[PDB]
Design an enzyme around this catalytic site. Structure first.
Site, PDB file in Angstrom:
ATOM      1  N   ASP A 103      14.157 -20.087  45.731  1.00  0.00           N
ATOM      2  CA  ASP A 103      14.567 -19.925  44.202  1.00  0.00           C
ATOM      3  C   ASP A 103      14.676 -18.367  43.711  1.00  0.00           C
ATOM      4  OD1 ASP A 103      11.544 -19.205  44.019  1.00  0.00           O
ATOM      5  OD2 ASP A 103      11.126 -21.392  44.049  1.00  0.00           O
ATOM      6  N   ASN A 135      10.829 -20.278  50.195  1.00  0.00           N
ATOM      7  CA  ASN A 135      11.442 -20.646  49.153  1.00  0.00           C
ATOM      8  C   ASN A 135      12.719 -20.084  48.884  1.00  0.00           C
ATOM      9  OD1 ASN A 135       9.234 -22.160  48.656  1.00  0.00           O
ATOM     10  ND2 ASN A 135       8.306 -20.698  47.017  1.00  0.00           N
ATOM     11  N   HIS A 143      14.156 -18.553  54.892  1.00  0.00           N
ATOM     12  CA  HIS A 143      15.119 -19.831  54.739  1.00  0.00           C
ATOM     13  C   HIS A 143      16.217 -19.213  54.033  1.00  0.00           C
ATOM     14  CE1 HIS A 143      11.921 -23.029  55.759  1.00  0.00           C
ATOM     15  NE2 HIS A 143      12.216 -22.164  56.777  1.00  0.00           N
ATOM     16  N   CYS A 152      31.365 -16.319  51.086  1.00  0.00           N
ATOM     17  CA  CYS A 152      32.496 -16.997  51.666  1.00  0.00           C
ATOM     18  C   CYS A 152      32.295 -17.252  53.086  1.00  0.00           C
ATOM     19  CB  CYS A 152      33.736 -16.236  51.599  1.00  0.00           C
ATOM     20  SG  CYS A 152      35.163 -16.617  52.629  1.00  0.00           S
ATOM     21  N   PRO A 191      10.727 -28.655  41.782  1.00  0.00           N
ATOM     22  CA  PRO A 191       9.995 -29.639  42.551  1.00  0.00           C
ATOM     23  C   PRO A 191       9.940 -29.428  43.974  1.00  0.00           C
ATOM     24  CG  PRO A 191      12.206 -30.623  42.133  1.00  0.00           C
ATOM     25  CD  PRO A 191      11.989 -29.290  41.552  1.00  0.00           C
ATOM     26  N   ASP A 192       8.629 -30.155  44.560  1.00  0.00           N
ATOM     27  CA  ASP A 192       8.187 -29.979  45.988  1.00  0.00           C
ATOM     28  C   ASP A 192       9.331 -30.619  46.722  1.00  0.00           C
ATOM     29  OD1 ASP A 192       4.969 -30.382  47.004  1.00  0.00           O
ATOM     30  OD2 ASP A 192       6.471 -31.371  48.258  1.00  0.00           O
ATOM     31  N   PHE A 193       8.812 -30.116  48.154  1.00  0.00           N
ATOM     32  CA  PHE A 193       9.691 -30.987  49.373  1.00  0.00           C
ATOM     33  C   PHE A 193       8.974 -32.393  49.699  1.00  0.00           C
ATOM     34  CE2 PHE A 193      11.747 -27.049  49.657  1.00  0.00           C
ATOM     35  CZ  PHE A 193      13.144 -27.271  49.814  1.00  0.00           C
ATOM     36  N   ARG A 194       7.696 -32.323  50.095  1.00  0.00           N
ATOM     37  CA  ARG A 194       7.115 -33.438  50.840  1.00  0.00           C
ATOM     38  C   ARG A 194       6.046 -33.991  49.886  1.00  0.00           C
ATOM     39  NH1 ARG A 194       9.453 -32.078  55.704  1.00  0.00           N
ATOM     40  NH2 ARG A 194       9.305 -30.007  56.363  1.00  0.00           N
TER      41      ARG A 194
HETATM   42  C1  LIG Z   1      17.901 -21.632  42.858  1.00  0.00           C
HETATM   43  C2  LIG Z   1      18.217 -23.191  42.427  1.00  0.00           C
HETATM   44  C3  LIG Z   1      17.529 -23.967  43.581  1.00  0.00           C
HETATM   45  C4  LIG Z   1      18.006 -25.606  43.550  1.00  0.00           C
HETATM   46  C5  LIG Z   1      18.669 -25.775  44.859  1.00  0.00           C
HETATM   47  C6  LIG Z   1      17.765 -26.596  45.948  1.00  0.00           C
HETATM   48  C7  LIG Z   1      18.351 -26.425  47.316  1.00  0.00           C
HETATM   49  C8  LIG Z   1      17.358 -26.177  48.346  1.00  0.00           C
HETATM   50  C9  LIG Z   1      17.640 -26.112  49.693  1.00  0.00           C
HETATM   51  C10 LIG Z   1      16.697 -25.471  50.560  1.00  0.00           C
HETATM   52  C11 LIG Z   1      17.139 -25.658  52.176  1.00  0.00           C
HETATM   53  C12 LIG Z   1      16.314 -24.316  52.951  1.00  0.00           C
HETATM   54  C13 LIG Z   1      15.762 -25.187  54.230  1.00  0.00           C
HETATM   55  C14 LIG Z   1      14.599 -26.060  53.587  1.00  0.00           C
HETATM   56  O1  LIG Z   1      14.938 -27.170  53.285  1.00  0.00           O
HETATM   57  O2  LIG Z   1      13.217 -25.918  54.015  1.00  0.00           O
HETATM   58  C15 LIG Z   1      12.156 -26.555  53.072  1.00  0.00           C
HETATM   59  C16 LIG Z   1      11.198 -26.009  52.926  1.00  0.00           C
HETATM   60  O3  LIG Z   1      11.578 -24.394  52.584  1.00  0.00           O
HETATM   61  C17 LIG Z   1      10.333 -26.018  54.166  1.00  0.00           C
HETATM   62  C18 LIG Z   1       9.121 -25.885  53.990  1.00  0.00           C
HETATM   63  O4  LIG Z   1       8.529 -26.822  53.243  1.00  0.00           O
HETATM   64  P1  LIG Z   1       7.155 -26.506  52.304  1.00  0.00           P
HETATM   65  O5  LIG Z   1       7.332 -25.042  51.562  1.00  0.00           O
HETATM   66  O6  LIG Z   1       6.011 -26.113  52.952  1.00  0.00           O
HETATM   67  O7  LIG Z   1       7.191 -27.588  51.142  1.00  0.00           O
HETATM   68  P2  LIG Z   1       6.305 -28.916  51.423  1.00  0.00           P
HETATM   69  O8  LIG Z   1       6.626 -29.679  50.512  1.00  0.00           O
HETATM   70  O9  LIG Z   1       6.259 -29.063  52.714  1.00  0.00           O
HETATM   71  O10 LIG Z   1       4.557 -28.329  51.068  1.00  0.00           O
HETATM   72  C19 LIG Z   1       4.361 -28.308  49.793  1.00  0.00           C
HETATM   73  C20 LIG Z   1       2.764 -27.751  50.012  1.00  0.00           C
HETATM   74  O11 LIG Z   1       2.265 -27.349  48.654  1.00  0.00           O
HETATM   75  C21 LIG Z   1       1.401 -28.394  48.175  1.00  0.00           C
HETATM   76  N1  LIG Z   1       1.593 -28.099  46.687  1.00  0.00           N
HETATM   77  C22 LIG Z   1       2.558 -28.528  46.003  1.00  0.00           C
HETATM   78  N2  LIG Z   1       2.488 -28.123  44.744  1.00  0.00           N
HETATM   79  C23 LIG Z   1       1.164 -27.464  44.710  1.00  0.00           C
HETATM   80  C24 LIG Z   1       0.661 -26.574  43.686  1.00  0.00           C
HETATM   81  N3  LIG Z   1       1.121 -26.440  42.488  1.00  0.00           N
HETATM   82  N4  LIG Z   1      -0.549 -25.944  43.874  1.00  0.00           N
HETATM   83  C25 LIG Z   1      -1.066 -25.895  45.391  1.00  0.00           C
HETATM   84  N5  LIG Z   1      -0.472 -26.563  46.095  1.00  0.00           N
HETATM   85  C26 LIG Z   1       0.698 -27.282  45.776  1.00  0.00           C
HETATM   86  C27 LIG Z   1       1.713 -29.430  48.532  1.00  0.00           C
HETATM   87  O12 LIG Z   1       0.469 -30.444  48.306  1.00  0.00           O
HETATM   88  C28 LIG Z   1       1.999 -29.256  49.811  1.00  0.00           C
HETATM   89  O13 LIG Z   1       1.128 -29.241  50.625  1.00  0.00           O
HETATM   90  O14 LIG Z   1      10.657 -27.668  54.224  1.00  0.00           O
HETATM   91  C29 LIG Z   1      11.804 -28.109  53.834  1.00  0.00           C
HETATM   92  O15 LIG Z   1      12.695 -28.210  54.809  1.00  0.00           O
HETATM   93 ZN   LIG Z   2      36.992 -15.528  51.800  1.00  0.00          ZN
END
Ligand SMILES: CCCCCCCCCCCCCC(=O)O[C@@H]1[C@H](O)[C@@H](COP(=O)(O)OP(=O)(O)OC[C@H]2O[C@@H](n3cnc4c(N)ncnc43)[C@H](O)[C@@H]2O)O[C@@H]1O
Ligand SMILES: [Zn+2]
Length: 294
Positions: free
Chosen positions: A115, A113, A132, A140, A39-42
């Site tokens: 992932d 990302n 990121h 550790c 899923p998306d963030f915003r």
């Molecule tokens: C491997 C297992 C994964 C599960 C674990 C999950 C834990 C994740 C923890 C992340 C921690 C890293 C720091 C962090 O959080 O940064 C986040 C993130 O990297 C950063 C940057 O934000 P970002 O990558 O720009 O994500 P956004 O949600 O802000 O932007 C999504 C954009 O894309 C558009 N869109 C959506 N879907 C589509 C689609 N199918 N096709 C075309 N466009 C699409 C949306 O409309 C939107 O414009 O803001 C956030 O802190």
């Molecule tokens: Zn250690």
């Protein structure tokens, strides 16, 4: 001057198969992985922020904070429990960047990302700036001990719902992602200072261009570098109250193009104009099949 005939995908396709287009940088974000189930963030609907309810947090954007993590690492690992996808299948868009790599055009993929889907699609560490961090390795959190653990080990726990502790010392072990409160990797700054001297085309996909310093990379390119945005909404335009963002629409627009829709569809269309449609369809189908036999 103005390097594109027209400010459209067709303009960008003609420019790409020309002389002047040798080095391409991709800036990508969570939009390119939503169609793989991550899923998306915003996004209002399925975004992460309007689904942080049942994680009993003091406030939504606080579960990716480093000092809260070391204080209570359990909500984050519970979140990773819910999010951790069954299969790791990169999207058409990810494979589009693999084509760019294979055709010698990709200079770098800058990704926000965590992932690892750029790697599974076959981008190699030399190609990537995981701005990121990444979930692919874990360390550790000590210093005396910075023992690296693979994703296979970090996945047993999370799903065995056991908080990962180092085996050598007894310290917490954290996925190599960059939590809020942490600094971006040195590699990010080293690549940025050199990559954006060279670049002939900026490809921005599935990112809202709000987080910094990542958003500012679009202004690090020369002013004549065409910049295509594939996203379901426009992004990266200057706020009218602040005061080189994207200009798609003013009369001063000369190099920015917004294709609005699904990243997978935008990459299909761009590949079609390029003569790569079949090559791309074969690659995705070949790789998704090879992954479905695991
Ligand atoms: C491997 C297992 C994964 C599960 C674990 C999950 C834990 C994740 C923890 C992340 C921690 C890293 C720091 C962090 O959080 O940064 C986040 C993130 O990297 C950063 C940057 O934000 P970002 O990558 O720009 O994500 P956004 O949600 O802000 O932007 C999504 C954009 O894309 C558009 N869109 C959506 N879907 C589509 C689609 N199918 N096709 C075309 N466009 C699409 C949306 O409309 C939107 O414009 O803001 C956030 O802190
Ligand atoms: Zn250690």
């Amino acid at each position: 001057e103005r390097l594109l005939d027209e400010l459209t995908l067709e303009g960008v396709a003609r420019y790409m198969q020309s002389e002047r287009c040798r080095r391409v940088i991709c800036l990508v974000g969570a939009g390119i992985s939503t169609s793989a189930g991550i899923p998306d963030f915003r996004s209002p609907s399925t975004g992460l922020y309007d689904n942080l309810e049942k994680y009993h947090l003091p406030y939504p954007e606080a579960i990716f904070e480093i000092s809260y993590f070391k204080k209570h690492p359990e909500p984050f690992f519970a979140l990773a429990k819910e999010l951790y996808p069954g299969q790791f299948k990169p999207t058409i868009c990810h494979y589009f960047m693999r084509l760019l790599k294979d055709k010698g055009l990709l200079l770098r993929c800058y990704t926000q990302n965590i992932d690892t889907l750029e790697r599974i699609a076959g981008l190699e560490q030399e190609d990537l700036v995981e701005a990121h961090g990444t979930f692919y390795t874990s360390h550790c959190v000590s210093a005396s001990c910075r023992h690296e653990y693979p994703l296979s080990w970090m996945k047993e726990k999370i799903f065995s719902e056991v908080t990962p502790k180092c085996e050598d010392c007894q310290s917490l072990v954290k996925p190599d992602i960059v939590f809020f409160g942490e600094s971006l990797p040195a590699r990010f700054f080293s690549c940025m200072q050199s990559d954006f001297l060279k670049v002939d085309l900026l490809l921005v996909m599935g990112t809202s261009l709000q987080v910094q310093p990542f958003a500012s990379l679009i202004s690090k390119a020369p002013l004549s570098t065409p910049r295509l945005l594939i996203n379901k909404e426009k992004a990266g335009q200057s706020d009218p109250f602040l005061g080189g963002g994207m200009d798609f629409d003013s009369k001063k627009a000369y190099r920015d193009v917004a294709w609005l829709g699904e990243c997978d569809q935008g990459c299909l269309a761009l590949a079609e104009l390029l003569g790569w449609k079949k090559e791309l369809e074969d690659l995705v189908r070949r790789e998704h099949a090879s992954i479905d036999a695991q």
